[PDB]
Scaffold this motif. Structure first.
Motif, short mmCIF file in Angstrom:
data_model
loop_
_atom_site.label_atom_id
_atom_site.label_comp_id
_atom_site.label_asym_id
_atom_site.label_seq_id
_atom_site.Cartn_x
_atom_site.Cartn_y
_atom_site.Cartn_z
N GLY J 36 0.79 -1.24 0.00
CA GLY J 36 0.00 0.00 0.00
C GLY J 36 0.82 1.28 0.00
O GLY J 36 1.92 1.32 0.54
N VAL J 44 0.70 -1.17 4.04
CA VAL J 44 0.33 -2.59 4.12
C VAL J 44 1.48 -3.50 3.69
O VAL J 44 2.14 -3.23 2.68
CB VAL J 44 -0.89 -2.90 3.22
N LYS J 62 -1.55 -10.82 6.39
CA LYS J 62 -1.11 -9.58 5.74
C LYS J 62 -1.04 -8.44 6.77
O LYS J 62 -2.06 -7.83 7.09
CB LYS J 62 -2.07 -9.20 4.60
N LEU J 64 -0.67 -5.03 8.38
CA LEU J 64 -0.75 -3.59 8.17
C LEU J 64 -0.06 -2.88 9.34
O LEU J 64 -0.71 -2.53 10.33
CB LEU J 64 -2.21 -3.15 8.06
N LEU J 65 1.25 -2.69 9.21
CA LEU J 65 2.08 -2.14 10.29
C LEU J 65 1.83 -0.66 10.53
O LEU J 65 1.41 0.07 9.62
CB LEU J 65 3.56 -2.37 9.99
N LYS J 66 2.10 -0.22 11.76
CA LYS J 66 1.94 1.18 12.15
C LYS J 66 3.07 2.05 11.59
O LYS J 66 4.13 1.54 11.22
CB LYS J 66 1.89 1.32 13.67
N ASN J 69 5.92 2.62 14.59
CA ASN J 69 6.57 1.37 15.02
C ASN J 69 7.68 0.85 14.10
O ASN J 69 8.60 0.17 14.57
CB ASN J 69 5.52 0.27 15.21
N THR J 71 10.97 0.45 12.09
CA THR J 71 12.36 0.91 12.24
C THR J 71 13.19 0.86 10.95
O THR J 71 14.14 1.64 10.80
CB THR J 71 13.10 0.08 13.31
#
Lengths: 80, 100, 164, 79, 94, 82, 56, 84, 72, 75, 69
Positions: J36, J44, J62, J64-66, J69, J71
């Motif tokens: 995404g 995403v 799948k 969908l990381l913040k 958060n 690195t």
RNA sequence: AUUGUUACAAUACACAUUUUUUGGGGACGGGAAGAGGAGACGUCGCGACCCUCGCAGAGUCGUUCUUGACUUGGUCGCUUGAUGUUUCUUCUUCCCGUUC
């Protein structure tokens, strides 16, 4: 310790204030300038440390402190 | 026109007269000082008010305690107000409770 | 006149001693030439305001009097006084830099209050008195007051310590 | 709109505060601002139960203030 | 100017804070957590955009002891104004 | 605008020390300044709290993590304030 | 003549003086509008648009 | 006002030396100067006082006084101090 | 092609698994809605403290700053 | 030169492999592929797998990381 | 808004110092206002490679000493 | 015998990375002796056989009785000095202070 009923930061400019950090390292210095983030310009910063009992002392810089790690300022004594 | 059972869950456990008395005690307390009454009601937040109840659903002992607290509040407030020296008896305080 | 509370209140506590700490108090109209004949009474009026540097020099103080916490009078200046004896349990840890020049400390036994300094007095100097002229005085001081680092401007060396 | 508005409306109330350190501090709010910049008149303190080590005058940044305890229990934010 | 901020008022009742709003409307208890191993219980009253809430019947629960032996301390507070940063999770109990 | 920022800008080409969040004490020249406190160094010594000291040729610091940036006794009164 | 928003009051005379006062702030100085003196002012109107002051 | 000292113990530290000086000069009058300006050591120190009389007295009394081994050579300053 | 916001939207009215940094507890429940600030609202919430469940919460809400990721 | 805004676009176009790094836990590192596009750092990540790297297969869909958060990211 | 002076450090190897003890290193390819440094190298630390390119975030990026001055 | 114009700040907007909304007789103390705390990295001090030898933030000039512009404690002991990281694993006797 002498300290009058001050209204705001503008009225209490050019005064010896003790500053507290986030980690817990006490400071002491004359407040020169002001800002949006409260970046108070210290006239002569005497930093102190306390191990995780007794407080240490130092004298490195006359720094312009950052606003992020600052907890709360406290007036020590008036000048002149 | 809205309908509410003001004796939210008391009629099954205690008698009608008793329920009425309780209501009177509560109401009077509220009148005296509402905030205090509210605080008394919601001391323990685990004792929640139901979706169709006007009061919190206590156990019997708990209810009694609440009542006692209310009574105390009523007395104290009265004392503060009219600078009376002391309540002589419980039967003298009945008048204070009911009539005002 | 006598050291009262009113006098203390009057005293100029504006100009801070910039060498160390803050609030260099000078009791009465001026502590320099105040003429406090009695002992330093009404110390409570200051109330541990401030090294503090309570410069009570050019006075007629018979005995050194203190009444405050562990950080209240580190750099105390009692120069040109008539200090006979300075025994006390109030100022235990604070008074390190003791300027007691031109005092009236006669005998070595008069310094017995300062002596046994391991607990009695955490720090003390003393110099420029009648007791300095006495025989083996420095040595005696070293023996008794081990906390005395600077003995009349010259330091208490290891050799000296050994000797005493 | 904002919860800070309510805070701004209040003044001269002896309100406690659970800071990041954990020590309480019940004093007057004085000049409360938009960014939660409180100024204590007189309050308790316990340096890092809570011990007795209070200070008179003080000024706190709004980032440190995790809570504001009650002084006058009243609900009236809108105006 | 007005319509930008005014449209965001209805967004609370639609999104994630809808539940919170509901709770506020109809006074009921809610378990509010914290950063430093804390657990608070209270009934909501007011609300805000950035979770700067105010509640009544504040029952606090937090530990102040070593890892060997726990100690559930308690204290009855009320009418607090907790900041939105410390608020992790909330939930309306039946 | 910010006064501190202005001061920083003024002090360009001067021995300015620093102190990070972790506690890595620096001591060197000031390369440049900005609105966001993005400091760059030259001949920057490193005397950290960890112990193992060093002498770095160059180093760029992030303003968010910085605790306090040091400054000399020359620029005290003039010519920043009035 | 008074503006429709009820805050601007124009005071004037035939000889060219036209001063607009703000009734919302007492401490605000009136604004002097330039009209040559030989052109006699008969009337001043505030137009409906809220921002034309027409000097007849 | 100012009194330029000379011929003193260089082996002693700066701050300590300053402190010592302060201690010495408090008997005569109010010492204005908190720290030394030269930063060279080995006698060169300017004891700034509030009153001239006090300074004079100091000059009179502490001429060749034993301070850290050696006798201090007291003398009046040529130019006036920046603080005064 | 598939954006993050879009994905989130799709995931509404379906099972979700969020985990926080400070005190790692896997929150399991059906996702209700989400806003511009990325705030969570769960139904039938089960706070799985590293596998083991503390208790069945029911309806719940979650802040944006605490959570790390979102999955099935 | 390659900017952060266009970088995202490039990633979207390609769908290459990645190894995401966490803030708190040093050992546990994510592995998958970004998808995404957005204004903020959040995006995403399809086929996520949290591997325990040295100073080994976490189950997840799948992810969908913040934004805050994350690195690191490779492409 | 105000762009950081990363043009001086362009086309040069830099020994980075990330948050939480992580001595990464790599040559700077691209930069931006948010400090998301587009670097074209990565090697953890003793030494061991782990992927060529690496675009790091703006928050976790405190110290960055340049190798070639 | 105030009105007008210009400039800069405050008030009125403010949850996403450089900032206010997320990376948590008995106890006690000190010093000394005997029996079964120690090593690194730095950072400031007490002595000196050493170095070094003097009056000025420093230098230059314009103009006038005091101001504007342009340049850029070091070393060695400690013969038991202080102090922050970082690894490992107490009892007896005397002396001095505080408390009951």
């Amino acid at each position: 310790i002498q300290v009058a009923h001050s209204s705001r930061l503008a009225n209490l400019i050019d005064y010896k204030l003790r500053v507290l950090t986030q980690d817990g390292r006490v400071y002491i210095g004359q407040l020169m300038a002001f800002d949006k983030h409260m970046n108070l310009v210290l006239n002569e910063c005497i930093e102190e440390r306390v191990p995780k009992i007794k407080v240490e002392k130092r004298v490195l810089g006359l720094t312009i402190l950052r606003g992020e790690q600052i907890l709360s300022t406290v007036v020590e004594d008036k000048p002149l | 026109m809205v309908l509410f059972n003001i004796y939210d869950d008391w009629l099954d456990r205690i008698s009608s007269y008793t329920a009425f008395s309780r209501l009177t005690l509560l109401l009077r307390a509220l009148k005296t000082n509402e905030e205090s009454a509210k605080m008394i009601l919601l001391s323990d937040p685990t004792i929640t008010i139901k979706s169709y109840h006007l009061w919190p659903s206590f156990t019997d002992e708990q209810w009694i305690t609440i009542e006692s607290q209310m009574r105390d509040l009523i007395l104290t407030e009265y004392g503060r107000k009219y600078n009376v020296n002391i309540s002589a008896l419980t039967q003298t305080e009945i008048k204070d409770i009911i009539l005002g | 006149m006598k050291f009262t509370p009113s006098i203390v209140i009057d005293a100029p506590q504006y100009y801070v001693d910039h060498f160390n700490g803050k609030y260099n108090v000078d009791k009465c109209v001026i502590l320099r030439d105040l003429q406090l004949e009695t002992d330093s009474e009404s110390m409570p009026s200051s109330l541990k305001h401030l090294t503090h540097i309570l410069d009570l020099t050019n006075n007629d103080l018979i005995m050194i009097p203190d009444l405050s916490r562990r950080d209240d009078i580190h750099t105390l200046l009692l120069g040109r006084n008539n200090i006979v004896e300075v025994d006390g349990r109030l100022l235990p840890m604070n008074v390190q830099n003791l300027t007691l020049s031109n005092n009236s400390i006669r005998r070595f036994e008069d310094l017995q209050r300062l002596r046994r300094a391991p607990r009695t007095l955490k720090n003390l100097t003393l110099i420029g008195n009648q007791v300095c002229h006495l025989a083996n005085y420095r040595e005696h001081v070293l023996r008794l007051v081990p906390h005395l680092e600077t003995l009349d401007f010259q330091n208490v060396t290891a050799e000296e310590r050994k000797s005493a | 709109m904002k919860l800070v508005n309510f805070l701004k409306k209040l003044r001269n109330e002896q309100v406690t505060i659970e800071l990041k350190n954990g020590t309480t501090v019940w004093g007057t709010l004085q000049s409360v601002s938009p960014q939660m910049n409180a100024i204590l008149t007189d309050v308790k303190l316990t340096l890092p139960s809570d011990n007795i080590a209070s200070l008179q005058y003080i000024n706190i940044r709004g980032n440190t203030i995790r809570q504001i305890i009650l002084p006058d229990s009243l609900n009236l934010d809108s105006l | 100017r007005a319509e930008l901020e005014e449209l965001e008022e209805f967004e609370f009742k639609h999104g994630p804070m809808s539940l919170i709003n509901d709770a506020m409307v109809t006074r009921t208890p809610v378990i509010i957590s914290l950063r430093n191993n804390h657990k608070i219980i209270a009934r909501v009253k007011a609300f805000d955009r950035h979770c700067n809430m105010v509640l009544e019947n504040v029952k606090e629960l937090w530990t102040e002891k070593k890892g060997k032996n726990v100690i559930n301390r308690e204290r009855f507070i009320s009418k607090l104004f907790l900041r939105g940063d410390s608020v992790i999770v909330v939930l309306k109990t039946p | 605008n910010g006064i501190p920022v202005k001061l920083l800008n003024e002090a360009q080409g001067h021995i300015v020390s620093l102190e990070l969040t972790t506690g890595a004490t620096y001591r060197g020249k000031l390369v440049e300044s900005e609105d966001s406190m993005n400091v760059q160094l030259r001949d920057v010594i490193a005397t950290e709290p960890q112990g193992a000291v060093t002498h770095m040729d160059q180093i760029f610091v992030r303003g968010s993590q910085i605790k306090f940036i040091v400054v000399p006794d020359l620029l005290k009164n003039a010519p920043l304030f009035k | 003549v008074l503006h429709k928003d009820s805050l601007l009051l124009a005071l004037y005379s035939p000889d060219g003086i036209l001063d607009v006062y703000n009734l919302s702030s007492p401490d605000q100085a009136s604004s002097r509008f330039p009209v040559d003196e030989e052109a006699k002012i008969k009337e001043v109107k505030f137009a409906d648009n809220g921002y034309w002051m027409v000097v007849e | 006002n100012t009194l330029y000292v000379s011929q003193l113990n260089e082996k002693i530290n700066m701050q300590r030396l300053r402190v010592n000086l302060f201690l010495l000069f408090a008997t005569f009058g109010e010492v204005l100067k908190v720290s030394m300006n030269f930063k060279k050591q080995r006698g060169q120190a300017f004891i700034t006082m509030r009153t001239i009389d006090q300074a004079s007295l100091a000059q009179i009394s502490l001429n060749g006084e034993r301070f850290f081994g050696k006798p201090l050579k007291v003398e009046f300053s040529k130019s006036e101090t920046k603080t005064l | 092609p598939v954006n993050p916001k879009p994905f989130l939207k799709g995931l509404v009215n379906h099972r979700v698994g969020v985990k926080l940094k400070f005190n790692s507890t896997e929150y399991r429940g059906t996702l209700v809605s989400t806003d511009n600030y990325f705030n969570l609202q769960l139904n039938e919430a089960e706070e799985f403290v590293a596998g083991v469940s503390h208790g069945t919460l029911g309806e719940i809400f979650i802040r944006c700053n605490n959570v790390l990721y979102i999955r099935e | 030169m390659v900017p952060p805004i266009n970088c995202i676009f490039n990633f979207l176009q390609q769908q290459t492999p990645v190894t995401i790094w966490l803030f708190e836990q040093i050992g546990i590192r994510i592995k998958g592929k970004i998808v995404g596009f957005d204004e903020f750092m959040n995006v995403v990540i399809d086929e996520a797998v949290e591997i325990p790297v040295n100073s080994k297969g976490t189950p997840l869909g799948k992810i969908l990381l913040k934004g805050d958060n994350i690195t690191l990211i490779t492409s | 808004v105000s762009t950081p002076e990363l043009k001086k450090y362009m086309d040069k190897k830099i020994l980075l110092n990330i948050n939480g003890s992580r001595k990464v290193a790599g040559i700077l390819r691209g930069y931006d206002i948010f400090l998301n440094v587009v670097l074209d190298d990565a090697m953890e630390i003793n030494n061991h490679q782990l992927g060529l390119q690496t675009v790091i975030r703006g928050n976790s990026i405190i110290s960055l000493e340049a190798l070639d001055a």
